[PDB]
Write a protein that binds this ligand. Structure first.
Ligand SMILES: O=C(O)c1cccc(-c2cc(=O)c(O)c(C(=O)O)[nH]2)c1
Ligand SMILES: [Mn+2]
Ligand SMILES: [Mn+2]
Length: 177
C-alpha cells in the first residue's frame, strides 16, 4: 500500500506510533484499514498543531493520551474550574475561554460534519476543518488567530494534494463514515 508508505513518509513518528498504537489495541490493522490510519494521523496532527498555537500554556491536549490519563486530565480540570464533565473525551481544553474543544476534520462539507458532531454531544466548543480551507465553529468563534488557522488549513490542503499526487485522494475522499 502506497497509503501506508505515504502515512510513514508524511507524518512525524510520534503521530504515526500513536495512531498505530490506538488502532492495534482495538484489533484494527493499519496495513488494511489504511484510509482510517491516514485520517487518525491527520486528526492528531491538527489537534497537536492547535495546541501548539498556545498564558503560554493556553490549551491542554486531551487527544493522543491513553484513556486513563485523558480522563485524569479532564477530571482534574473539572474539579478546579467547576466546568461540567463531558460524556465523551474531547480533544482540547481552552484555559483562556475556559471550555473544552472538539476538533473535527472532514473530507465532506463543513456544515454537514458540524451537525454530526453537535448532535453526538455538553457545552463543548466545536471547530471543524476540511481539506478545502473551510472551517466551522460554534457561534462562529474560531478561538485562534488567522495565522494559526491559516497554518492548519495549509497543512490539510497539502496532505490532500500529496495524497492526490499519489493517486490516493479519491479513495480517501470517499471513505468517511
Ligand atoms: O468519524 C468517525 O469515524 C468517528 C467515529 C467516532 C468517533 C470519532 C472521533 C472523532 C474525533 O475527532 C475524536 O477526537 C475522537 C476521539 O476519540 O477523541 N473520536 C470519529
Ligand atoms: Mn478526540
Ligand atoms: Mn476530534
Amino acid at each position: 500500500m502506497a497509503m501506508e508508505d505515504f502515512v510513514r513518509q508524511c507524518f512525524n513518528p510520534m503521530i504515526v506510533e500513536l495512531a498505530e498504537k490506538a488502532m492495534k489495541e482495538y484489533g484494527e490493522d493499519p496495513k488494511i484499514e489504511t484510509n482510517k490510519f491516514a485520517a487518525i494521523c491527520t486528526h492528531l496532527e491538527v489537534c497537536f498543531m492547535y495546541s501548539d498555537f498556545g498564558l503560554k500554556h493556553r490549551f491542554e491536549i486531551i487527544e493522543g493520551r491513553d484513556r486513563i490519563m485523558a480522563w485524569t486530565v479532564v477530571n482534574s480540570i473539572c474539579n478546579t474550574t467547576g466546568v461540567e464533565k463531558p460524556k465523551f473525551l474531547p480533544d482540547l481544553y481552552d484555559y483562556k475561554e475556559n471550555r473544552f474543544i472538539e476538533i473535527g476534520v472532514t473530507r465532506r462539507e463543513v456544515h454537514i460534519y458540524y451537525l454530526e458532531k453537535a448532535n453526538k454531544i455538553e457545552k463543548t466548543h466545536i471547530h471543524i476543518f476540511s481539506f478545502t480551507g473551510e472551517e466551522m465553529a460554534t457561534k462562529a468563534d474560531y478561538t485562534l488567530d488567522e495565522e494559526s488557522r491559516a497554518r492548519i488549513k495549509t497543512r490539510l490542503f497539502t496532505i490532500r494534494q500529496e495524497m492526490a499526487s499519489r493517486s490516493l485522494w479519491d479513495s480517501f475522499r470517499q471513505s468517511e463514515r
